[PDB]
Amino acid sequence: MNASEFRRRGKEMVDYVANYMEGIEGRQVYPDVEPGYLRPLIPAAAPQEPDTFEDIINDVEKIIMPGVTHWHSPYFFAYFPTASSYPAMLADMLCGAIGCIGFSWAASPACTELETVMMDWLGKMLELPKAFLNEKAGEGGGVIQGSASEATLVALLAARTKVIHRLQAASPELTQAAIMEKLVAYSSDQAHSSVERAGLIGGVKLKAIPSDGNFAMRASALQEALERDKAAGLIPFFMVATLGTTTCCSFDNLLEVGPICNKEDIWLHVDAAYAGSAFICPEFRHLLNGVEFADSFNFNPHKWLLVNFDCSAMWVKKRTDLTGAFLITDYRHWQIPLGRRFRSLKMWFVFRMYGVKGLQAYIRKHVQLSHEFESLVRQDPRFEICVEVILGLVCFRLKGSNKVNEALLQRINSAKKIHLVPCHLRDKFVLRFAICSRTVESAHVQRAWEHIKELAADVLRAERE
Amino acid sequence: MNASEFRRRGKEMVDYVANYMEGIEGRQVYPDVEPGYLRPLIPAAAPQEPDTFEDIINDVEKIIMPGVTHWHSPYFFAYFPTASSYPAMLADMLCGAIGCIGFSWAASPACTELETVMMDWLGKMLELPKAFLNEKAGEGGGVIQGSASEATLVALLAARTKVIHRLQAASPELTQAAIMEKLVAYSSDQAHSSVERAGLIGGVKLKAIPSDGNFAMRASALQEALERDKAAGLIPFFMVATLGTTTCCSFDNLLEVGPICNKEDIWLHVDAAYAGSAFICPEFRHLLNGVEFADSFNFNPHKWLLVNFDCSAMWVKKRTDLTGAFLITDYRHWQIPLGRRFRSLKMWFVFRMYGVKGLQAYIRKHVQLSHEFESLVRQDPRFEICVEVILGLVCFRLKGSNKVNEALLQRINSAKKIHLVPCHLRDKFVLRFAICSRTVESAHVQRAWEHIKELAADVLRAERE
Ligand SMILES: *Cc1c(COP(=O)(O)O)cnc(C)c1O
Ligand SMILES: *Cc1c(COP(=O)(O)O)cnc(C)c1O
C-alpha cells in the first residue's frame, strides 16, 4: 500500500469511524457471543495473496463488532470511563505517521521535549506543588507511563532501590536479599490489584490497611499496622494511597497518612488513576490536599481526561530517585520498557482543542449526571447508597441479602440493555453505577434507572416467594 | 469536537500524513535542534479557550517537525527498522475508535480472541513447533506484549516464580529471599540492555556468557560459566539467547545452548526482536533451529514486520508457567500491565493487506539491499567487515584505530545527510549500517556509501597528518 491508496482508504476509515460513533446508541452495549466464537469465523492461516480492504471492513462489521463491548456507548456504566476524543484520535494518526521510538533524545528530540512540557501543563492544571513540575530547574518532573498499574510498579521499584541503598549504607555487610524478606509495602484494603501485582513483581510483602467507615485509610489504622509490623522485624518502605478507589471511589486521607509516611521514611505513592482528572476543577482540588507529602503522584488521562489509551501521567519529587530504578533528555529509567511512542501529541491536541474550560465542563457534566442517578436511587427506599457520592460513581444496592443483589445484577447484564459491574464492601455485595461515555446525557441515566427499577421488582418478587 | 467535525479534520489529517510520507526524502533525517529547544516555542500553560486545528497543524510543521528524527526516511540507517505501514495505520484508527480496554474477556471478547488467532497465524508463518501455538487444545500459546524488553522481563518473572516454587518444594523451610541471592540469569555478552534491566527489576544476578569469534553464544562457554557458578553456590534459572543481536546481528547457537538449558532446568527465553521477522522466509528459517528447546520465544512485528509500534509477539510452551508470574480468555497474567488495547487489529490488517508473500518480498528486498551495501564496502580495502552479513545489518569500519572510526562517525552525523550509529565489538569501535525504511531503494544505499566513502577520505587525511 502506497500513500495514494492511503489517501483513499484513510478517508474511508475516517467515515467508518464517524459512522460507528454517530450510531453507537443503536449498538447492544454488551455482546451475546460466548468464549471461542471468533476462531471458527476466520481462516486458520494468513492469506498468501492479499485480501481487499472491502473484505476486511466487511469482516469488522460481520465478525469483530458482534464480539465488541462498546465502552463508549452511553449505556456503558461499568468499571470506570476510558478516554475517547477526536483530538486524541487525530494526534494518534500523526503519532503513527512520525513513527519514532523515543528511547533516547536523539531518537526524536520532540518526542521527549513535548512530553515534559505537557506534564508541566497538566501539573499546573491540577495545581500540583511546584516540587513535582520540571519547569524552572526543579529537581522534580513528570513522565507519561503506559498505565497506572505500570506507574505503581515503577514507584515501588524506585522505593525498593532507595531503601536497599539506605539500609546497606547503615550496614555495609547487609545483602540485598536479607533486606528483601523484611521489606513490607502498604495499601488500602480498597486498593486496586495493581498494588498486589507490583509487590509480587518487586518481590516484597504487601499488607492491607483496614479502611474506616467511609472506606478511607486513616492515621490510626496505619499507626496500628506500623506498630505491629515494626515489632515483628518488618521494614515499611512503600505505601500506595488511593484517591478514588476502584471499589467505591473513596479517598485515603493524605493529610493524615502523608506526615506519617514522611517521618517513617516510607515512599508515598498516590494512586489517583480515575479521580485525578477531576482535580483540575477548583471545587474538587481539596480532595488532593496532602499530595505535597507524596513522593510520587499518578493519574490516568486515558480514563477521565479524554486522552485515548495509553496515557498515564506520573510525577516525582526527585528524578534521581526514579532513575535509580531501571534538562530532561531521556525517559529510559522512568519506565519499565525502553521504547516509547509520541504519546504527548495526544495530550497536546486534547488540551489545545478542548481548552482547560472545555475539560472542566466535561468533568462537571459527568459528576452532575452521577448526582442525578444518586438522586433517583435516594427516592426509592428499597435501595440504599453505601458510600458518599463525590465523583462519577454511585455505589448502591437493594436493602437485604447479597443473594437478592447478585440476582438483580444477573438480570441487568442478561438483558444487555445497560452494562455495570459490582464490588464487595466488607462482606456486602454492592452494585456500581459509573458515568463513562463522553456522549452520555440525562436521558440515558434516567432510562438506565428505570430499567434497574423494573428488574429489581421482578427480583424482589422471586425472593419473598 | 463531534463526529461531523472529525469527518472533516480526520480526512485533512489523512492528507497531511500522506503528504509527509510522499515528501519524506526532502526532510533532513536527523535534526539540528539542541536539547531544550521546544519549551521556549510554546506557551507555559494550557489554553483556557480552545485553539484551532489550523493553529495546531501549523505548529506541527513549524515547531514539532524540526525536532523530529525521521525514522522512515530512506536515509535513516540507525539502530534497527521500526514498522510503518498504512494497513497498520488504518487498523490503529479503528482500534482507537472501538476504544476498549481488554483487561478481561468481558471487557471486549474480540479484543482477546483475535489476538490469539493472530498469534497462531504468525506462529505458523514462522513454522514454530506446535507446542507454541494455541490452536488444537495445545498447552502453549502466544500473546502480544508492549515490547521485547517487557517480554524478556515477563519470561524472567515466570522463570523466577517457577524456580522458587521448585526450590521450596524440595526444601519447605527455604524462604523466597534465601533463594533470591543464589539465583543467577545468563545472556550473551552481546545481549540487549533489556536483559540487564529485567535482572535488576526481578532482583536476581545476571552474568554475561563470552561470545565466540562470530559473537555467538556456544556450548563450551556456557558450560564453563555453569561449572564456575554452580561451584560458587549460584543457582542458574534463566537464560536469554539472542537471535540477531543488537550489536552486530549475530546468532546464539540454540542447537547447543538449548539442550544444556533443558538438562540444567534453566528457563530458555529466545530474544529475536529484530531477526524474528525474517524467519517467515524459508531460506532464513534455519537460523531459528533449536527453538523447540526454548520455553519462550519473542520477536517484534513492530521492528521488521510492518506492524506499527506497539506490537511484540511472545509465545510460551506452558501458559500455566506464564500465569504464575503476575480457551484463552484473559491476558492479565501474561503481561506487566492489566489494561491493553485492540492491538491485534494491526496484525490482522497487515497480514491480510500484504499477504504472506508480500511480507516475504519486503524482508528479501531489505536483505538484498543489505548485501548491496556490503558489496560496496568489500570493494574498498580501506574498510573491513567485522561480522558476517546475514540480514539487514552491516558492521564495518576503517582499518586502523578506533579514533579514526570515531572521527568518521562524527563527520557522518554532523553532515546530517544520513544517520547511523556505532557499536563496540570487544575493544573495537565499529560502525553499523541498518536497512530501515519501508521505501528504501538501491539508489539510497548507493548514495549513502558514496557519502561515507567521501568523508572517510577526509578523515584518513587528517590522521596521517
Ligand atoms: C483504573 C485504575 C487502575 C488501573 O490503571 P490502568 O491504567 O488500567 O493500569 C489502578 N488504580 C485505580 C485506582 C484505578 O482506578
Ligand atoms: C530492539 C531490540 C530489543 C528491544 O526491544 P523493544 O521492543 O524496543 O523493547 C531487545 N532485543 C533485541 C535483540 C532488539 O533488537
Residue numbers in the entry:
A (entry chain A), B (entry chain A): 1 to 326, 342 to 480
Q: What does the primary publication say about this deposited structure?
A:
Human aromatic amino acid decarboxylase (AADC) is a pyridoxal 5′‐phosphate‐dependent enzyme responsible for the biosynthesis of dopamine and serotonin, essential neurotransmitters involved in motor and cognitive abilities. Mutations in its gene lead to AADC deficiency, a monogenic rare neurometabolic childhood parkinsonism characterized by severe motor and neurodevelopmental symptoms. Here, for the first time, we solved the crystal structure of human holoAADC in the internal aldimine (1.9 Å) and in the external aldimine (2.4 Å) of the substrate analog L‐Dopa methylester. By combining various high‐ and low‐resolution structural approaches, we determined that AADC is a mobile homodimer presenting asymmetric behavior among subunits, thus behaving as a conformational heterodimer.
The superposition of the active sites of human native and DME‐bound AADC shows that the pyridine ring of PLP faintly tilts when it converts from the internal to the external aldimine, being the main difference associated to the presence of the CL from the neighboring subunit orienting the catalytic Tyr332' (the prime denotes residues belonging to the neighboring subunit) in a H‐bond relay with His192 and Ser193 in the proximity to the a‐C of the ligand. Slight changes are observed in the orientation of loop3 residues Arg347' and Leu353' contributing in trans to the active site in the transition from internal to external aldimine. Besides these local changes, further small alterations far from the active site are observed by monitoring the root mean square deviation (RMSD) between native and DME‐bound AADC structures. The highest deviations are observed for loop3 (since it is solved only in the DME‐bound AADC). Slight changes are also visible in the backbone of residues 34–36 belonging to the α1‐loop‐α2 motif (NTD), in the stretch containing residues 434–436, immediately after helix α16 (417–430) and participating to sheet β10 (436–440) (CTD), as well as in the segment 135–139. Crystallographic data of human apo and holoAADC show that Arg27 is placed at the end of helix α1 and interacts with Glu61 of helix α3 through the formation of a salt‐bridge. This saline interaction could favor the assembly of the NTD and in the meanwhile it could properly orient the stretch of the residues 28–36 towards elements of the CTD (the nearby helix α16 close to sheet β10), in turn connected to the active site. Gln28 interacts with Asp32 which is engaged with Lys431 of the CTD, thus reinforcing the network of interactions between NTD and CTD. As for the holo form, the equilibrated structure does not show important divergence in comparison to the crystal structure, even if some small changes are visible in close proximity to helix α6, as in the apo structure. On the contrary, CL flexibility is minimally affected by PLP binding since it is similarly digested in both apo and holo conformations.
